[PDB]
mmCIF file of all heavy atoms in Angstrom:
data_model
loop_
_atom_site.group_PDB
_atom_site.id
_atom_site.type_symbol
_atom_site.label_atom_id
_atom_site.label_comp_id
_atom_site.label_asym_id
_atom_site.label_seq_id
_atom_site.Cartn_x
_atom_site.Cartn_y
_atom_site.Cartn_z
ATOM 1 N N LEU A 103 12.436 8.003 1.157
ATOM 2 C CA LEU A 103 12.811 9.263 1.860
ATOM 3 C C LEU A 103 12.165 9.311 3.251
ATOM 4 O O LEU A 103 12.815 9.847 4.161
ATOM 5 C CB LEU A 103 12.407 10.467 1.006
ATOM 6 C CG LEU A 103 12.974 10.458 -0.412
ATOM 7 C CD1 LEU A 103 12.261 11.478 -1.277
ATOM 8 C CD2 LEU A 103 14.482 10.680 -0.438
ATOM 9 N N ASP A 104 10.947 8.788 3.428
ATOM 10 C CA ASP A 104 10.290 8.722 4.768
ATOM 11 C C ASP A 104 9.510 7.415 4.923
ATOM 12 O O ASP A 104 8.333 7.342 4.571
ATOM 13 C CB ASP A 104 9.387 9.931 5.038
ATOM 14 C CG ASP A 104 8.804 9.931 6.446
ATOM 15 O OD1 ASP A 104 9.452 9.368 7.363
ATOM 16 O OD2 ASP A 104 7.697 10.473 6.616
ATOM 17 N N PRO A 105 10.145 6.359 5.485
ATOM 18 C CA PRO A 105 9.489 5.067 5.715
ATOM 19 C C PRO A 105 8.685 4.968 7.021
ATOM 20 O O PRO A 105 8.187 3.906 7.323
ATOM 21 C CB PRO A 105 10.689 4.113 5.777
ATOM 22 C CG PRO A 105 11.755 4.947 6.447
ATOM 23 C CD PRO A 105 11.558 6.346 5.900
ATOM 24 N N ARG A 106 8.569 6.076 7.753
ATOM 25 C CA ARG A 106 7.807 6.189 9.025
ATOM 26 C C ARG A 106 6.375 6.702 8.756
ATOM 27 O O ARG A 106 5.612 6.849 9.725
ATOM 28 C CB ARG A 106 8.604 7.108 9.958
ATOM 29 C CG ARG A 106 9.487 6.371 10.953
ATOM 30 C CD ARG A 106 8.756 6.235 12.277
ATOM 31 N NE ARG A 106 8.833 4.903 12.855
ATOM 32 C CZ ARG A 106 8.142 4.502 13.916
ATOM 33 N NH1 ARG A 106 7.308 5.329 14.526
ATOM 34 N NH2 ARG A 106 8.283 3.267 14.363
ATOM 35 N N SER A 107 6.008 6.937 7.490
ATOM 36 C CA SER A 107 4.729 7.559 7.045
ATOM 37 C C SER A 107 3.649 6.500 6.794
ATOM 38 O O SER A 107 3.681 5.875 5.719
ATOM 39 C CB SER A 107 4.944 8.377 5.793
ATOM 40 O OG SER A 107 3.710 8.621 5.133
ATOM 41 N N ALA A 108 2.690 6.355 7.709
ATOM 42 C CA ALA A 108 1.547 5.417 7.588
ATOM 43 C C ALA A 108 0.785 5.656 6.270
ATOM 44 O O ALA A 108 0.290 4.678 5.708
ATOM 45 C CB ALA A 108 0.640 5.552 8.794
ATOM 46 N N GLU A 109 0.715 6.898 5.786
ATOM 47 C CA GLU A 109 -0.167 7.330 4.662
ATOM 48 C C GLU A 109 0.349 6.773 3.332
ATOM 49 O O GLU A 109 -0.473 6.363 2.508
ATOM 50 C CB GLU A 109 -0.263 8.855 4.579
ATOM 51 C CG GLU A 109 -0.555 9.522 5.918
ATOM 52 C CD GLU A 109 0.643 10.131 6.644
ATOM 53 O OE1 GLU A 109 1.732 9.492 6.687
ATOM 54 O OE2 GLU A 109 0.487 11.256 7.173
ATOM 55 N N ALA A 110 1.659 6.789 3.118
ATOM 56 C CA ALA A 110 2.325 6.224 1.920
ATOM 57 C C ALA A 110 2.137 4.695 1.871
ATOM 58 O O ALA A 110 1.756 4.179 0.783
ATOM 59 C CB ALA A 110 3.784 6.612 1.916
ATOM 60 N N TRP A 111 2.358 4.001 2.999
ATOM 61 C CA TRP A 111 2.122 2.538 3.148
ATOM 62 C C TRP A 111 0.682 2.216 2.766
ATOM 63 O O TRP A 111 0.468 1.265 1.994
ATOM 64 C CB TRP A 111 2.410 2.072 4.577
ATOM 65 C CG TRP A 111 3.867 2.063 4.907
ATOM 66 C CD1 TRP A 111 4.514 2.841 5.819
ATOM 67 C CD2 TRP A 111 4.873 1.240 4.299
ATOM 68 N NE1 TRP A 111 5.852 2.550 5.826
ATOM 69 C CE2 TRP A 111 6.103 1.571 4.909
ATOM 70 C CE3 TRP A 111 4.849 0.248 3.314
ATOM 71 C CZ2 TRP A 111 7.303 0.950 4.560
ATOM 72 C CZ3 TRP A 111 6.034 -0.364 2.965
ATOM 73 C CH2 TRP A 111 7.242 -0.020 3.586
ATOM 74 N N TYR A 112 -0.259 2.958 3.351
ATOM 75 C CA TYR A 112 -1.717 2.806 3.143
ATOM 76 C C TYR A 112 -2.001 2.933 1.642
ATOM 77 O O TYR A 112 -2.632 2.033 1.074
ATOM 78 C CB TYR A 112 -2.472 3.853 3.972
ATOM 79 C CG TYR A 112 -3.968 3.841 3.792
ATOM 80 C CD1 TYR A 112 -4.717 2.721 4.106
ATOM 81 C CD2 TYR A 112 -4.636 4.950 3.298
ATOM 82 C CE1 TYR A 112 -6.095 2.702 3.939
ATOM 83 C CE2 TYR A 112 -6.010 4.952 3.124
ATOM 84 C CZ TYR A 112 -6.740 3.821 3.446
ATOM 85 O OH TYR A 112 -8.094 3.814 3.284
ATOM 86 N N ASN A 113 -1.491 3.991 1.015
ATOM 87 C CA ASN A 113 -1.801 4.345 -0.388
ATOM 88 C C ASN A 113 -1.116 3.358 -1.334
ATOM 89 O O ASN A 113 -1.708 3.069 -2.392
ATOM 90 C CB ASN A 113 -1.453 5.801 -0.681
ATOM 91 C CG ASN A 113 -2.520 6.748 -0.187
ATOM 92 O OD1 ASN A 113 -3.536 6.318 0.348
ATOM 93 N ND2 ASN A 113 -2.292 8.036 -0.341
ATOM 94 N N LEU A 114 0.053 2.838 -0.960
ATOM 95 C CA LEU A 114 0.704 1.703 -1.672
ATOM 96 C C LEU A 114 -0.195 0.463 -1.539
ATOM 97 O O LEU A 114 -0.456 -0.230 -2.558
ATOM 98 C CB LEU A 114 2.107 1.490 -1.087
ATOM 99 C CG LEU A 114 3.108 0.745 -1.969
ATOM 100 C CD1 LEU A 114 3.428 1.509 -3.240
ATOM 101 C CD2 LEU A 114 4.402 0.470 -1.217
ATOM 102 N N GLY A 115 -0.718 0.206 -0.343
ATOM 103 C CA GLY A 115 -1.747 -0.834 -0.170
ATOM 104 C C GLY A 115 -2.849 -0.698 -1.215
ATOM 105 O O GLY A 115 -3.136 -1.685 -1.909
ATOM 106 N N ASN A 116 -3.418 0.504 -1.333
ATOM 107 C CA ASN A 116 -4.592 0.817 -2.192
ATOM 108 C C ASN A 116 -4.246 0.586 -3.662
ATOM 109 O O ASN A 116 -5.102 0.065 -4.372
ATOM 110 C CB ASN A 116 -5.086 2.258 -2.009
ATOM 111 C CG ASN A 116 -5.723 2.479 -0.658
ATOM 112 O OD1 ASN A 116 -6.048 1.518 0.047
ATOM 113 N ND2 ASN A 116 -5.870 3.739 -0.276
ATOM 114 N N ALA A 117 -3.057 0.998 -4.098
ATOM 115 C CA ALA A 117 -2.599 0.840 -5.498
ATOM 116 C C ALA A 117 -2.566 -0.651 -5.853
ATOM 117 O O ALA A 117 -3.054 -1.011 -6.949
ATOM 118 C CB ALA A 117 -1.255 1.496 -5.693
ATOM 119 N N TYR A 118 -2.075 -1.488 -4.933
ATOM 120 C CA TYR A 118 -1.998 -2.960 -5.110
ATOM 121 C C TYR A 118 -3.405 -3.547 -5.102
ATOM 122 O O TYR A 118 -3.695 -4.423 -5.925
ATOM 123 C CB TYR A 118 -1.099 -3.600 -4.051
ATOM 124 C CG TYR A 118 0.364 -3.509 -4.401
ATOM 125 C CD1 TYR A 118 1.268 -2.871 -3.567
ATOM 126 C CD2 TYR A 118 0.845 -4.055 -5.582
ATOM 127 C CE1 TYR A 118 2.613 -2.797 -3.881
ATOM 128 C CE2 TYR A 118 2.186 -3.984 -5.916
ATOM 129 C CZ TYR A 118 3.070 -3.344 -5.067
ATOM 130 O OH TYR A 118 4.393 -3.257 -5.394
ATOM 131 N N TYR A 119 -4.262 -3.052 -4.216
ATOM 132 C CA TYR A 119 -5.684 -3.463 -4.151
ATOM 133 C C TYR A 119 -6.331 -3.279 -5.529
ATOM 134 O O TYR A 119 -6.904 -4.233 -6.064
ATOM 135 C CB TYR A 119 -6.412 -2.690 -3.057
ATOM 136 C CG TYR A 119 -7.821 -3.155 -2.832
ATOM 137 C CD1 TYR A 119 -8.120 -4.049 -1.818
ATOM 138 C CD2 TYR A 119 -8.859 -2.695 -3.633
ATOM 139 C CE1 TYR A 119 -9.425 -4.465 -1.598
ATOM 140 C CE2 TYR A 119 -10.164 -3.113 -3.440
ATOM 141 C CZ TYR A 119 -10.442 -3.997 -2.416
ATOM 142 O OH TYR A 119 -11.714 -4.423 -2.223
ATOM 143 N N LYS A 120 -6.180 -2.097 -6.120
ATOM 144 C CA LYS A 120 -6.797 -1.715 -7.417
ATOM 145 C C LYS A 120 -6.250 -2.528 -8.600
ATOM 146 O O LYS A 120 -6.972 -2.600 -9.609
ATOM 147 C CB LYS A 120 -6.585 -0.225 -7.663
ATOM 148 C CG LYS A 120 -7.361 0.661 -6.708
ATOM 149 C CD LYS A 120 -8.821 0.762 -7.046
ATOM 150 C CE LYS A 120 -9.309 2.185 -6.938
ATOM 151 N NZ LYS A 120 -10.681 2.310 -7.472
ATOM 152 N N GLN A 121 -5.048 -3.109 -8.502
ATOM 153 C CA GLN A 121 -4.491 -4.022 -9.544
ATOM 154 C C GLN A 121 -5.003 -5.453 -9.357
ATOM 155 O O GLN A 121 -4.734 -6.266 -10.249
ATOM 156 C CB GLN A 121 -2.965 -4.096 -9.488
ATOM 157 C CG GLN A 121 -2.266 -2.784 -9.797
ATOM 158 C CD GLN A 121 -0.761 -2.928 -9.807
ATOM 159 O OE1 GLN A 121 -0.080 -2.409 -10.691
ATOM 160 N NE2 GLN A 121 -0.225 -3.629 -8.820
ATOM 161 N N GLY A 122 -5.632 -5.778 -8.220
ATOM 162 C CA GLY A 122 -6.034 -7.156 -7.870
ATOM 163 C C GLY A 122 -4.927 -7.949 -7.180
ATOM 164 O O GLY A 122 -5.073 -9.167 -7.045
ATOM 165 N N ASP A 123 -3.865 -7.292 -6.720
ATOM 166 C CA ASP A 123 -2.756 -7.931 -5.970
ATOM 167 C C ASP A 123 -3.079 -7.851 -4.471
ATOM 168 O O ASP A 123 -2.488 -7.050 -3.748
ATOM 169 C CB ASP A 123 -1.415 -7.304 -6.348
ATOM 170 C CG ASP A 123 -0.228 -8.166 -5.965
ATOM 171 O OD1 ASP A 123 -0.403 -9.077 -5.101
ATOM 172 O OD2 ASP A 123 0.861 -7.926 -6.539
ATOM 173 N N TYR A 124 -3.981 -8.707 -4.025
ATOM 174 C CA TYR A 124 -4.632 -8.606 -2.705
ATOM 175 C C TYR A 124 -3.626 -8.919 -1.597
ATOM 176 O O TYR A 124 -3.779 -8.347 -0.515
ATOM 177 C CB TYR A 124 -5.908 -9.452 -2.708
ATOM 178 C CG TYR A 124 -6.925 -8.962 -3.704
ATOM 179 C CD1 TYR A 124 -7.397 -9.774 -4.726
ATOM 180 C CD2 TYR A 124 -7.395 -7.656 -3.638
ATOM 181 C CE1 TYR A 124 -8.323 -9.307 -5.649
ATOM 182 C CE2 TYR A 124 -8.314 -7.171 -4.555
ATOM 183 C CZ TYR A 124 -8.779 -8.003 -5.557
ATOM 184 O OH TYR A 124 -9.682 -7.506 -6.441
ATOM 185 N N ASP A 125 -2.612 -9.750 -1.835
ATOM 186 C CA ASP A 125 -1.687 -10.151 -0.733
ATOM 187 C C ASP A 125 -0.602 -9.078 -0.584
ATOM 188 O O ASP A 125 -0.129 -8.864 0.555
ATOM 189 C CB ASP A 125 -1.146 -11.584 -0.861
ATOM 190 C CG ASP A 125 -1.156 -12.198 -2.253
ATOM 191 O OD1 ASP A 125 -1.294 -11.437 -3.243
ATOM 192 O OD2 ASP A 125 -1.025 -13.440 -2.336
ATOM 193 N N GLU A 126 -0.228 -8.402 -1.668
ATOM 194 C CA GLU A 126 0.648 -7.210 -1.567
ATOM 195 C C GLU A 126 -0.109 -6.156 -0.752
ATOM 196 O O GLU A 126 0.411 -5.723 0.281
ATOM 197 C CB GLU A 126 1.073 -6.756 -2.958
ATOM 198 C CG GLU A 126 2.078 -7.695 -3.606
ATOM 199 C CD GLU A 126 3.519 -7.435 -3.202
ATOM 200 O OE1 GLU A 126 3.876 -7.746 -2.046
ATOM 201 O OE2 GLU A 126 4.272 -6.888 -4.039
ATOM 202 N N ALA A 127 -1.344 -5.835 -1.149
ATOM 203 C CA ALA A 127 -2.244 -4.894 -0.440
ATOM 204 C C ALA A 127 -2.162 -5.137 1.069
ATOM 205 O O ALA A 127 -2.030 -4.151 1.824
ATOM 206 C CB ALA A 127 -3.654 -5.059 -0.937
ATOM 207 N N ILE A 128 -2.227 -6.413 1.464
ATOM 208 C CA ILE A 128 -2.300 -6.894 2.872
ATOM 209 C C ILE A 128 -0.998 -6.593 3.601
ATOM 210 O O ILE A 128 -1.064 -6.136 4.763
ATOM 211 C CB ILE A 128 -2.599 -8.400 2.926
ATOM 212 C CG1 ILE A 128 -4.052 -8.671 2.531
ATOM 213 C CG2 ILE A 128 -2.264 -8.957 4.307
ATOM 214 C CD1 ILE A 128 -4.328 -10.091 2.119
#
């Protein structure tokens, strides 16, 4: 619905970080 939102990208980064998916996070 809003792909211009830095905050959603960031928080998707964090969710991947917490699973150990470090290259998705990146």
Side-chain angles (χ1 to χ4, degrees):
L103 305 166
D104 185 28
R106 263 264 134 189
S107 162
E109 312 100 317
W111 288 114
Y112 177 61
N113 280 358
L114 201 64
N116 290 345
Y118 278 121
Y119 186 97
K120 292 283 224 171
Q121 296 183 136
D123 198 342
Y124 297 121
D125 22 16
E126 288 276 72
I128 288 161

